[PDB]
Ligand SMILES: Nc1nc(C(=O)O)c(CCc2ccccc2)s1
């Protein structure tokens with residue numbers, strides 16, 4: 444079964460096999476007085492691993508590398524952060540110290556610098572406009588436009604029809620927006636529509652936080668978003 448927030452002590456990381464050569468990683472961290480789970484992705488890249496997002500902090504991210512080495516045993520050589528918040532770039536310095544080449548869009552790297560967060564080393568070209576997609580090893584990176592954040596990316600694994608929505612996609616059970624301080628509430632439904640249009644075949648959809656679902660998570664998130672927008 445997919446691991447839940449209460450089953451993961453802060454500082455520990457679980458891996459979950461979604462498909463051949465595709466895992467999510469699950470960690471937990473405190474924010475504003477409560478503890479939340481957070482998802483990232485791991486994808487086999489030939490003889491190497493591509494990492495999508497940190498495990499939300501330096502300590503969790505170190506535990507992530509240890510768990511990858513224990514359970515999979517291939518080297519993590521590249522990492523992509525899908526926006527500038529700490530559940531995506533917090534731990535980048537650990538990754539870099541461990542030998543991992545870290546990447547993000549120019550906009551994410553800039554927003555991280557402005558925020559005082561950790562800054563991935565390398566800039567990803569070709570994602571500056573809503574609807575842009577680029578290939579990055581075994582995944583496609585896609586900028587759907589502003590949503591949870593202005594810089595947020597989603598990731599698609601064609602080999603397994605796995606769509607990683609990051610924090611622009613909410614889990615089914617989540618019915619309130621919570622904190623959306625950096626969100627573009629007006630653009631977010633349009634951005635989810637681009638995701639739907641571009642990955643109509645997705646079979647597994649992983650939100651940034653919580654339980655995986657299917658394409659139903661997109662409409663679900665749009666419903667939550669405008670509700671918070673509708674009063
Ligand atoms: N770093 C973090 N991002 C987010 C986010 O919204 O992207 C957090 C709130 C997530 C949440 C809320 C309710 C239930 C389960 C999870 S915390």
Ligand SMILES: [Zn+2]
Pocket residue numbers: 526528591592610
């Ligand atoms: Zn975020």
Ligand SMILES: [Zn+2]
Pocket residue numbers: 528530610651652
């Ligand atoms: Zn988040």
